[PDB]
Symmetry: D2
């Protein structure tokens, strides 16, 4: 009765923030969904129940996406529990703000690893089944920072730019098939991290801390929501997007337009 009914989706890093919002919107559109976090937590059962309110099959699998063997374990688990992975959402929020000169090498490596190389490993693992089955959606959660630069975000802008380049190549290698690969580029979203960071900067520096943060970059002077990012994923996963290939859906309140 719904546009993604019966489709099996995996959303990496979906226990909070944008990834959870995407999982919620895919389930709301009918998809069965595998949630993923780095480690098991007491809250995980509650998060499953939240997504399960949309009446589809929901599962949870703990896996560190920097470890190729655990990425493989996540795909195999999905195949055992639900069937083939049909919709792969490569989502990874890790950020670190620092000028280039003092940017820690281990943080640089981790941002590249999780935001770019983990998407390669998961895509590599999922493509053979998608080709056999004649259908697939690979949806890479990039950023405005994949299209433009911002100060003190060198690793993140590099990784997100790279994820957009990767998206184009996967789409070209699958262009004659029922598999598409595209990227979503959000602007500022009010994530759990951001709500803590603004509340902390307001108590030290409220609606005025929020306005200063948004006004520099985001002409709408409002946040993008996790539901809006999820709605872009649902659109890319739908039949109307059968010929949307290798492109970006930018949800940013005007950031890249100026």
């Amino acid at each position: 009765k719904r546009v993604l009914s019966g489709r099996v989706a995996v959303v990496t890093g979906s226990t909070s923030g944008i990834g959870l919002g995407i999982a919620m919107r895919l389930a709301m559109a009918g998809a069965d969904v595998v949630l993923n976090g780095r480690r098991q937590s007491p809250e995980d059962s509650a998060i499953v129940e939240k997504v399960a309110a949309y009446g589809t099959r929901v599962r949870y699998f703990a896996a560190n996406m920097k470890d190729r063997a655990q990425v493989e374990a996540l795909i195999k688990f999905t195949e055992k529990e639900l069937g083939a992975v049909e919709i792969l959402v490569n989502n990874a929020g890790i950020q670190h703000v620092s000028p280039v000169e003092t940017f820690p090498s281990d943080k640089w490596d981790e941002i590249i690893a999780l935001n770019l190389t983990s998407a390669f490993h998961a895509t590599q693992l999922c493509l053979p089944s998608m080709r056999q089955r004649g259908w697939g959606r690979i949806i890479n959660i990039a950023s405005v920072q994949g299209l433009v630069g911002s100060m003190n975000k060198s690793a993140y802008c590099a990784a997100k730019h790279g994820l957009i380049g990767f998206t184009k190549v996967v789409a070209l290698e699958t262009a004659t098939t029922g598999i598409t690969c595209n990227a979503i580029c959000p602007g500022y979203v009010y994530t759990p991290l951001v709500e803590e960071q603004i509340k902390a900067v307001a108590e030290a520096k409220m609606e005025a801390a929020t306005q200063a943060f948004l006004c520099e970059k985001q002409p709408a002077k409002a946040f993008v929501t996790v539901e809006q990012v999820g709605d872009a994923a649902v659109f890319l996963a739908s039949p109307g997007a059968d010929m949307i290939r290798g492109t970006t859906i930018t949800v940013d309140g005007g950031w890249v337009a100026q």
Copy 2:
């Protein structure tokens, strides 16, 4: 349905992409005003095809190059259905020619219909959208608004220009409930595109349309398949929906990979 009650105007919607957009908006619940350069015997049939989806459908003939007729189209919509809430600027034309011999009149007409008419229609609709606090302006650009192709100088210029205009309107409305965005299709099987293929078929392939279609598509479109008017319409419905309240000043490219390579 996601657009139920909303009043939409689609310019150049008697065939091809414009008709496909109008069809999809009506399916999503919008009332729709169709438009063509001139009244046609088949206009009444086209209205009924779009009316099959149970919304209010009207037709108004108007030459989009004439600012007075653009104004007449908007006032006709306000009288028959109500304030314009979704404006789709689509009417366009094509002319294939090397730059040196490109006819001056054809250059001017392509700029006027593909770019300046969108400006005029947008100018006329924004005051009401601002007063009501909601609007969608959806400009039908092209892959040719992001990249160039040989022998399409005027079209690429006009479509690039329409994308630039889209950004400015979006920025001037960014703090409102009005969004402005562009859809960029690749090759769509339309009567016009079919003519382009016909021309290639006789010049290069002995009139064989199957061989010419594949050669035509594979030059530019990695999917080796056409984009459909239904798909362009589905992108328009997405941009008009609430999930797109924060999509502003951007392009939705529906092109089988053309701009990815």
Copy 3:
């Protein structure tokens, strides 16, 4: 002796601002240069003298670039006086700031006509000679506003975006020849026209304080917090006209202090 020695260049709208800076730098690089303004002015001979300081041949021709007949007359004048047009710089600064709802129709049309359609006409008229000779440069002066939008500049952003699209097509149609076509995209440049734009802002919002208005004007858009200069735009034109750019085709050289990078 210099990298463009002996090349004949035509720079439209070159009696002030960016066009004059381009003419100056092309002459410095050895090119003979034809200057152009909309109409004759008392200052024309002094502008000729400025460009002629670099030891090349210089001419001046008044022509309204909106009128295709006068564009043709400019090209024929150059052919008579100096020789075949080898470097064509399509340059036009016209601007009008207004929200879209009240943007005057005649100003919209003027901006499209001068910033886009005039380039098409001049390119059409110059391409046959360049093709016959197997060499050419068409350099279109676009803007950052041809790559991104800015509030209250709908017509200019549309025209400059269009000029970049036109650039790509001309480049593709000439890609197997010695003719190249590219665009330069300046940010905010220190010119009389831009100073008039800043003065309007200073009077409207900063109590006449040109320093404060300039700071805010640049800070809004240009991360360098400093102007691009007309000499720098001219240096980009010299680069595109040089042999090292024989395979630079259909692209943008953006000179903007970081504007489009963010």
Copy 4:
């Protein structure tokens, strides 16, 4: 002789013993810069390459360093500082390529391409920026590719790395925008190099039965409208332009030298 546009400036070009890197080193030296060349390891040919670049009358040196090893990148910068002076022009060039569909792309090759084509540029830039800021002048010139702006089949790692290098370029430029330091990228298309000759050799042997002229036009015509190669000298000319005073306000952008590839 008379002073030249880059006289007195000290440049380091990574991966400059052949190909694009060598062409850039040559053109910088011709423009008056002192130049430190770099290769992965000591080879019998290093003397000959130094002397070629030194023919233009500037100070030229050679240092062997694996750019994947941050300690060796640091040794390269310190070697330059000791032998010639502060590094003023950094050209991040050392690259590698590997053509494979995504499904079978080897993990070690993916990591190597990311490490050399992206992370090495970050390390070298980090090491050079403090001195540039103290002196109030610098040029960081990153050698990207058309593949940093568009995708191509079977080049997933390379396109990802070169896209990432362009994103990095923007951030460095923005962090330095109010200084005399600029950072920009050059995006070549197909360049006549032994490496790209190998790519045509692979296509020639696999589809054209060893023929090379037929493959060459087919190889170029797919992607490069000029139907001709870009030259290492032209890439070098773009680097000289970015290093020159006329580019003081060119920041965070790309100079695409590609025969029209990205224009269509």
